[PDB]
Design a protein around this ligand. Sequence first.
Ligand code: EMC
Length: 238
Amino acid sequence: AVDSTVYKGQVLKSLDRNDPLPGRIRYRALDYSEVEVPFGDKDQKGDFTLRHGDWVQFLLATDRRDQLQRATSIALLDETFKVSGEKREQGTIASLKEGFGFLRCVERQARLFFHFTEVLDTSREIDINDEVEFTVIQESRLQAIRIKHLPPNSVQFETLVASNIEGCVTREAPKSIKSQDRVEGGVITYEHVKKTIMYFLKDCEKPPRIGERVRFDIYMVKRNKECIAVNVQQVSLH
Ligand code: EMC
């Protein structure tokens, strides 16, 4: 039946999702010979997208009735992403439906669709707020494929890039009800090469007036490709 050694090889021919065993995997046998072995749909541990050149794990199954050896229980190896050249992005599982879900992306504004079949690890469960790494493909329909679980505290949606930066309020934030503005905001001008940066009333205690000197921290919001001034406070000693 199935051999017990964990074999390592590369995908020579991917499966066409758009011959019962059309796939091909090239590996090095224990006797240092180069071997090609076929595989089919059920030979992958999950219905995820395998690609030409992917490093994979598999077990060798011998079918005496079909008179051929087969690669089975194929799983994608993480080392592929170190040599793949594909764009790997980060995010967290935002919602879970039946068969699909949506991810909150680090570098993208919109929620990203993803099929449950693209989760690489079939040994563990998926939950909300799971930190994941994926590859985005386009078909105007976007989806995340080859989704890998990330260790805790690996995903940061915003980064502190500077602290105690000083500038001048060149457009006061709109005098605002209970809901906090997150679109209009104000404008702070600082020469830290003069630059502008947006601030919002939610990120200051006591709103600064137009033309007043302020001190603030700068955070990089990656999904918006912009920085935001927070912890805004007035400066008396200029
Ligand atoms: C230092 C006055 Hg905006």
